[PDB]
């Protein structure tokens, strides 16, 4: 699962930044390159990625390396969306946080039989900022670090 019109889009995107056809683009056009592709990367993520990508500080990247990073980023974006889609199914009162109330309702609808003590344990374990409920970032973080997706 990669595809063809999508492999060919990535190529187009790559060539925008390689008008002279030297076969590389400057690692610095990454963010603009990702945006042309529909992504919305953030500073930290770009800092992090330019650093994974240009491990030998050439300042340059080829098409295979670009293709990788973009396939990888498309898979992550799909995962995020799916995690976000589940976020919304726990937060059915749409308060934008997942509560103890939401979580208990979800366990029941799915036929679990946890105690409030276990239910609370699952909040605390997810609640990093200590506001007593679970944000999207917390929920993303919590999926990021479990069994498989």
């Amino acid at each position: 699962e990669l595809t063809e019109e999508q492999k060919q889009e990535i190529r187009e995107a790559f060539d925008l930044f390689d008008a002279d056809g030297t076969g590389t683009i400057d690692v610095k056009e990454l963010k603009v390159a990702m945006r042309a592709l529909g992504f919305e990367p953030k500073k930290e993520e770009i800092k992090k990625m330019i650093s994974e990508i240009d491990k030998e500080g050439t300042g340059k990247m080829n098409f295979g390396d670009f293709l990788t990073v973009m396939t990888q980023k498309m898979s992550e974006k799909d995962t995020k969306e799916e995690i976000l889609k589940a976020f919304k199914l726990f937060d059915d009162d749409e308060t934008g946080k997942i509560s103890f109330k939401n979580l208990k309702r979800v366990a029941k609808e799915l036929g679990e039989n946890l105690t409030d003590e276990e239910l609370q344990e699952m909040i605390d374990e997810a609640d990093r900022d200590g506001d007593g409920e679970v944000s999207e970032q917390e929920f993303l973080r919590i999926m990021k670090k479990t069994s498989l997706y």
Partner: peptide, 17 residues
């Protein structure tokens, strides 16, 4: 855990509609 419950809700929803 979080993931079973999330996965549960996702299946429950990809099935209904």
């Amino acid at each position: 855990n979080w993931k079973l419950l999330a996965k549960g809700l996702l299946i429950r929803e990809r099935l209904k509609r």
